[PDB]
Symmetry: C2
Subunit: 153 residues, 2 copies
């Protein structure tokens, strides 16, 4: 673990700002899936909503230079969206002046299922992964899981 | 400019966490001073409060080893605080970040400057630095649409 790796392991700051500072390039987001799904029991618990509530499920790459620096999976309860914010669905957040806090649930170094390894196009299969909530008006607004290919940082 | 300097320039995460990661040492926060001041015109404007309103003024060091990795200067209008938040601030030894976590403060940030300078002789002596370049930043923490805290931070580039 180098110094960037260790900052990634512990930070509660924007991961896009870190990527932009490291690469000195703007992050480009590619959406790989976006679906409305119904929350099961465990997802309902995580998002503090009722089982069967609608949740926006999104999978993305964050690119910088032209390489993938993160893969990110998010769950956003629709019940929780202001009507403007809903039609739009971090860029949505600075744009709407959203006040929130971040709750880092876990972070870890791991391999890196062979699927993910091939997807990201990495030789060294070590990734940092983390999970956090974005808390707005005292409730989970978004739960985010992120994967950082270590050899890229 | 290295990657860590550039991270420091833009980050909205805990500077305490970043220093502990870079050094792999625990940081100790020293509150050098905490005072009550009355806002003059420029402060009242910075904080959008009334001239004469009471402001908590706090100067802090982040040390890792025995070396200063950051100096932070904060202004916090006392009227903008709930009772228990205010008392925690008055306790003086509880870092601002911890106070906000403890009270579940939701916020956003507005950066006012983030730049490389250009440290005068006194700040250089104060930090104990040969190369005088520092990252200087200033931002407001906005809560409930108002300025909760204005924070200035100096990081000696030498230590990173």
């Amino acid at each position: 673990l180098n110094a960037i790796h260790r900052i990634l392991m512990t930070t509660d700051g924007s991961i896009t700002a870190i990527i932009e500072a490291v690469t000195q390039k703007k992050v480009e987001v590619e959406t790989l899936e976006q679906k409305i799904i119904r929350a099961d029991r465990e997802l309902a618990e995580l998002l503090e909503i009722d089982e069967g509530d609608e949740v926006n499920y999104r999978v993305v790459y964050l690119r910088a230079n032209g390489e993938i620096y993160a893969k990110a999976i998010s769950f956003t309860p629709l019940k929780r969206l202001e009507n403007s914010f809903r039609e739009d669905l971090g860029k949505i957040m600075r744009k709407h002046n959203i006040e929130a806090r971040r709750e880092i649930r876990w972070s870890r170094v791991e391999e890196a299922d062979l699927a993910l390894a091939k997807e990201l196009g990495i030789a060294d299969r070590r990734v940092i992964s983390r999970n956090y909530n974005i808390i707005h008006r005292g409730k989970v607004l978004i739960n985010i899981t992120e994967f950082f290919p270590m050899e890229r940082f």
